[PDB]
Design an enzyme around this catalytic site. Structure first.
Site, short mmCIF file in Angstrom:
data_model
loop_
_atom_site.label_atom_id
_atom_site.label_comp_id
_atom_site.label_asym_id
_atom_site.label_seq_id
_atom_site.Cartn_x
_atom_site.Cartn_y
_atom_site.Cartn_z
CE1 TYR A 23 21.42 -0.88 1.95
CE2 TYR A 23 20.00 0.08 3.60
CZ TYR A 23 20.43 -1.02 2.86
OH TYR A 23 19.85 -2.27 3.03
CD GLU A 186 20.34 -9.70 -3.74
OE1 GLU A 186 21.01 -8.72 -4.15
OE2 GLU A 186 19.30 -9.56 -3.05
CE1 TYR A 249 14.76 -6.01 0.91
CE2 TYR A 249 15.94 -7.01 -0.90
CZ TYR A 249 15.86 -6.68 0.43
OH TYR A 249 16.87 -7.02 1.30
CD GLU A 256 9.43 -3.98 -7.85
OE1 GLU A 256 10.41 -3.47 -8.43
OE2 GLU A 256 9.51 -4.98 -7.12
CD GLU A 286 19.37 -9.77 1.27
OE1 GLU A 286 19.01 -8.69 0.71
OE2 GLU A 286 20.52 -10.19 1.19
#
EC number: 2.4.1.-
Length: 394
Positions: A23, A186, A249, A256, A286
């Protein structure tokens, strides 16, 4: 080289540089598309390098490594008032498994970057972003849809790679620049054996300290609840210079994504309140400006967006096409974005600071510090507020 009690981290990730993420650099993956068919596009760096072969992969990656980030980027980072970068790197930069398709050469550029950081008064974390067999099955680990970090000898291989990183970058040579080594990005807690993960973290901690290094050890939260790590690697047990990395995030589930802007802001503020209660130094390593999962291939190659009801059985919320180009954004979406950025900045400055994901992307504005800053959506200077005191911290 850093005072975690008194200083605040204001930084950016150098993502997409040493670990390919579709991406972020879609141009490297798009040549594999057949018209509108994405079935043949390699899904991760493992398969990208395998499909190309060693010669073509190295030619293309050498061009990428030499141009994606340069000294000029570090100058601009410093000029924007940032004091820190996080540098993701995969295990394969240091060690290959038998039959691994990956190519090497990243370390040359890692070491150039450490010098550029020194020159521009920028401090650094080195982050092991990808472990053999994958610690999370995300494409950002190098190997999508596999979860074998705790299988076979993959944990031992990871520790061996960490020992190399410790000896090279945890010593006196970079003590003015390197303010943390992050053991593993992660690890996907819910699918791992957490007892074995804790043992791995402890072995990494002990190994580093045994080299005579005083470099801070950064542990990612493994997607555990706030406070989970409070009783691990503690001063009571003589374990010191430990920082917890939280990633935040609000775009990777239907629930969400369906929140209104006020509820997005409330969640951001609560991140601040809850992080303040924790017993370790902590940094938001992040986060981004994204309020949608619309960026092409954010969820992976050949997967759509939840936001437009095209992935993960999510309901349709809105069309992505209008949101792909920042010049096509409504005034309302620009304002929502600025509000959301400021709330997150306040929440993260309330503890150790913040590290935006990421410095740059080819064409995904929600994920590009550069693009957001140039369009007036990220505060510049970073202390500027159009929406002061949304959270009411005290």
């Amino acid at each position: 080289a850093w005072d975690y009690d008194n200083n605040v981290i204001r930084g950016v990730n150098l993502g997409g540089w040493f670990v390919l993420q579709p991406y972020m650099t879609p141009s490297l993956f798009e040549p594999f598309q057949n018209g509108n068919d994405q079935s043949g596009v390699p899904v991760d760096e493992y398969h990208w390098t395998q499909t190309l072969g060693k010669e073509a992969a190295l030619r293309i990656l050498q061009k990428h490594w030499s141009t994606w980030i340069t000294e000029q980027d570090f100058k601009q980072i410093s000029n924007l008032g940032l004091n820190f970068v996080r540098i993701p790197i995969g295990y394969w930069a240091f060690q290959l498994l038998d039959n691994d398709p990956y190519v090497q050469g990243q370390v040359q550029y890692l070491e150039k970057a450490l010098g550029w950081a020194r020159k521009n008064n920028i401090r650094v974390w080195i982050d092991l972003h990808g472990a053999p067999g994958s610690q999370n099955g995300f494409d950002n680990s190098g190997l999508r849809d596999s979860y074998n970090f705790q299988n076979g000898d993959n944990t031992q291989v990871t520790l061996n790679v960490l020992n190399t990183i410790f000896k090279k970058y945890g010593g006196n040579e970079y003590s003015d620049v390197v303010i943390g080594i992050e053991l593993l990005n992660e690890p996907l807690g819910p699918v791992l054996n957490m007892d074995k993960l804790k043992q791995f973290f402890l072995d990494g901690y002990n190994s580093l300290r045994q080299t005579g290094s005083v470099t801070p050890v950064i542990i990612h939260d493994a997607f555990q609840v706030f406070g989970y790590w409070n009783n691990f690697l503690t001063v009571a047990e003589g374990q010191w210079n430990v920082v917890v990395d939280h990633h935040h995030y609000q775009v990777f589930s239907g629930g969400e994504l369906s929140r209104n802007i006020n509820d997005h802001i409330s969640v951001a503020c609560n991140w601040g309140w809850d992080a303040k209660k924790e017993s370790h130094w902590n940094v938001a390593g992040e986060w981004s400006a994204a309020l949608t999962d619309c960026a092409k291939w954010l969820n992976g190659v050949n997967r759509g967006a939840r936001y437009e009801g095209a992935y993960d059985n999510a309901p349709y919320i809105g069309s992505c096409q209008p949101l792909l180009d920042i010049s096509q954004w409504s005034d309302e979406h620009k304002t929502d974005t600025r509000r959301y950025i400021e709330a997150q900045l306040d929440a993260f400055e309330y503890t150790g600071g913040w590290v935006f994901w990421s410095w740059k992307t080819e064409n995904a504005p929600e994920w590009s510090f550069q693009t957001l800053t140039y369009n007036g959506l990220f505060p510049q200077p970073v202390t500027d507020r159009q929406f002061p005191n949304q959270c009411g911290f005290h």
